[PDB]
Structures are given as structure tokens and as C-alpha cells.
Amino acid sequence: SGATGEELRADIYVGVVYYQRLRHMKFQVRSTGPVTMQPVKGRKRHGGIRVGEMERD
DNA sequence: CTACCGATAAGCAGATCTCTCGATTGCGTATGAA
Secondary structure: OOOOOOOOOOOOOOOOOOOOOOOOOOOOOOOOOOOOOOOOEOOOOOOEOOOOHHHHO
């Protein structure tokens, strides 16, 4: 282990494998700004998030 | 004889979560100053 420094209980299964990186890299936040006087739609437009009917339920 | 309405095959309106990007915006034809 790297914190205690003691040996682990069992031998770890370690090896080399081929690993690929994907392109799915998203976060949005608003307080005021663009706006039926309701806030605009769109992440890139500084919009909000719609509270759907199921959310109201 | 017959007015009214309850047994019988068929026409109209309506239906089926949230988010990010990208792309795109039918096709046609006439008047009048020179």
C-alpha cells in the first residue's frame, strides 16, 4: 500500500492492457442573465434547466 | 295509416424523459422604366 506502506493481504492482479480515450469530455450554471420572461434554452447561451412535469410531481 | 325511437355498420380527433453538438432553411413568375 502507498499510505500505510504495509503489504496487502493478497497478491494483486496486475498487467498491461490497451486503453483508449473517448471524446465524451458539459457543466452549466446560471444565476441571472438571458430570458415569456422565462430563461432561455441552451448551455452555450447561458440558459437554464427546465423543471419538467415529472420534476414538479 | 303512422310518429317515435331503440335493435342493427361506419366518420372525426386524438394519442402515444433530459441534455449536448453538427447541419440546413422548397420551388416558382409578373410589371414597367428605359
